[PDB]
């Protein structure tokens, strides 16, 4: 750590504060994650044990690069490449006008290629959300924060006590299968796209159940036609109120036909039909993607 000059704090996440900091020898700017290393209670946290081993294999433009781990006795330091903002912030700083169409279809494109890489390396992110997407002033945008990611060499069993987030969480989990799939990453991305479109969280629930119900209010409540399985999912109830699927162009006015087609496949109820990252990248909506920079 000799050669870092801490420059200012720029966030926490999860067992650690993030600094902006600069390497006094190369001049490179970086983002340091400092970990609480209690060498008497818990040892290395399980997040940091994921984030690192995972990221250390994923090397790629829309995954945040992990430069180096300084492993002292009492301190663990993760050196990341450095990105100036997060999409959450951007969108906040930018609602009122909204993020430019073009910028949006760029972002989504890139997130798809990031994720698309993640899955094809047997690696699940689970925690998609604008706070965990970092952008830079060249109009890049990079999956980040892998403390929740799991390898799925074997299927990944659900937390009953999901410490996971609302807001962006597949209905299949909310009805409590005992596994995650690729699909959940997509579902989140889905919603982020929406939000980016419409400058408000597509599904802002206040509880596991409000959240189901907000989705149902938008997608309309699902049946067995639409989602073979549902009626027999642990959290499923014939209690549920029937809502009626809504015209998307109601939800995402600004979106053109191509966009909406993409969205509505993204948000498919059936994990088994919901489009993959690979496949989305091939969607028509991407046709005239470019690379605008943010107004940062």
């Amino acid at each position: 750590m000799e050669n870092f000059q801490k420059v200012e704090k720029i966030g926490e996440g999860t067992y650690g504060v993030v600094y902006k900091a600069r390497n006094k020898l190369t001049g490179e700017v970086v983002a340091l994650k400092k970990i609480r290393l209690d060498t008497e209670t818990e040892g290395v946290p399980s997040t940091a044990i994921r984030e690192i081993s995972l990221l250390k294999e994923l090397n790629h433009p829309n995954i945040v690069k992990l430069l180096d781990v300084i492993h002292t006795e009492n301190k663990l330091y993760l050196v990341f490449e450095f990105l100036h903002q997060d999409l959450k912030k951007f969108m906040d700083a930018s609602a009122l006008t909204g993020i430019p169409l073009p910028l949006i279809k760029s972002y989504l494109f890139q997130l798809l290629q990031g994720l698309a890489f993640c899955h094809s390396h047997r690696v699940l992110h689970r925690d998609l959300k604008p706070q965990n997407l970092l952008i830079n002033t060249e109009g890049a945008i990079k999956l980040a924060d892998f403390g929740l990611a799991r390898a799925f060499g074997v299927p990944v069993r659900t937390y009953t006590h999901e410490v996971v987030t609302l807001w962006y969480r597949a209905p299949e989990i909310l009805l409590g299968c005992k596994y995650y799939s690729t699909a959940v990453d997509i579902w989140s991305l889905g919603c982020i796209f929406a939000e980016m479109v419409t400058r408000r969280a597509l599904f802002p629930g206040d509880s596991e159940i409000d959240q189901l119900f907000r989705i149902f209010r938008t997608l309309g409540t699902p049946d067995e036609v639409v989602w073979p399985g549902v009626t027999s999912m642990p959290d499923y109830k014939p209690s549920f109120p029937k809502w009626a699927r809504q015209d998307f162009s109601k939800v995402v006015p600004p979106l053109d036909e191509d966009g909406r087609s993409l969205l509505s496949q993204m948000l498919h109820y059936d994990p088994n039909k919901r489009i993959s990252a690979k496949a989305a990248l091939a969607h028509p909506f991407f046709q005239d993607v470019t690379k605008p920079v943010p107004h940062l």
């Binding site: 044990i49 081993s53 060499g153 069993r157 690729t182």
Partner: protein, 258 residues
């Protein structure tokens, strides 16, 4: 969503080569021996049984242990410590949340202090340079299992069992890639339950002809034949339970048709 299976499968394969241990290494440990290692593993199986850990967590831990052994000399005195550390990491990586260190410490009959177990996890990490995401036979079986017609869970159990079995003996099994043993296992298990065989699917997926499998088959069948005399037993007792259809009870079959 068979959109990834292939990519993945292939990645496993490429990985599984990098993250492999040194065949000839028990031989350079001046103070430990294969036997001792068998001790340690059976022991983990058990510990895994007690904290209801998944099987993968186990696979991982051994992996760790081997690699770690694979560049560190360690006295009979240290090794179980090494185990624990691996067991702890592995859970950490693998499980939804692990046991707390303290438990880990306690399951060794307070023989190492919680501090040393800490000072160890960190040493392991340091030696495997956080390369924790290792491919396991389990990982392999699981993909493998996708290609059963139909599925049939005796087989599945049987295979895992086989699987675990080989965890135990560096002996022969270090000589063999996780994906092979996998194969061996699946097909041993297949044969055994159904008298059917290693599906062309899988030969096509894996490029493993049944022939190629044959040397690792021989070993494994023997292991299975003797399983019940083995010096270590934790694994059997484990696949005795209904959750596995006592698969392990049920009889090896005496010849392989080879």
């Amino acid at each position: 969503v068979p959109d990834y299976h292939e990519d993945i499968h292939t990645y496993l394969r490429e990985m599984e080569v990098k993250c492999k241990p040194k065949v000839g290494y028990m031989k350079k440990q001046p103070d430990i021996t294969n036997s001792m290692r068998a001790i340690l593993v059976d022991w983990l199986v058990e510990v895994g049984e007690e904290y209801k850990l998944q099987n993968e967590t186990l696979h991982l831990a051994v992996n760790y242990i081997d690699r770690f052994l694979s560049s560190m000399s360690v006295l009979r005195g240290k090794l179980q410590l090494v185990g624990t550390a691996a067991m702890l990491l592995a859970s950490k990586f693998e499980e939804i949340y692990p046991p707390e260190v303290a438990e880990f410490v306690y399951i060794t009959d307070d023989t190492y202090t919680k501090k040393q177990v800490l000072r160890m996890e960190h040493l392991v990490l340091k030696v495997l340079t956080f390369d924790l995401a290792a491919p396991t036979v389990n990982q392999f079986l699981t993909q493998y299992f996708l290609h059963q017609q139909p599925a049939n869970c005796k087989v599945e159990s049987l295979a895992m069992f086989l699987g675990e079995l080989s965890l135990i003996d560096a002996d022969p099994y270090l000589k063999y890639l996780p994906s092979v043993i996998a194969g061996a296992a699946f097909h041993l298990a297949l044969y055994t339950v159904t008298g059917q065989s290693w599906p062309e699917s899988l030969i096509r997926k894996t490029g493993y002809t049944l022939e190629s499998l044959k040397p690792c088959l021989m070993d494994l069948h023997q292991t299975y034949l003797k399983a019940p005399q083995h010096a270590q037993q934790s694994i059997r007792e484990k696949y005795k339970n209904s959750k596995y259809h006592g698969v392990s009870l049920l009889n090896p079959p005496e010849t392989l048709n080879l």
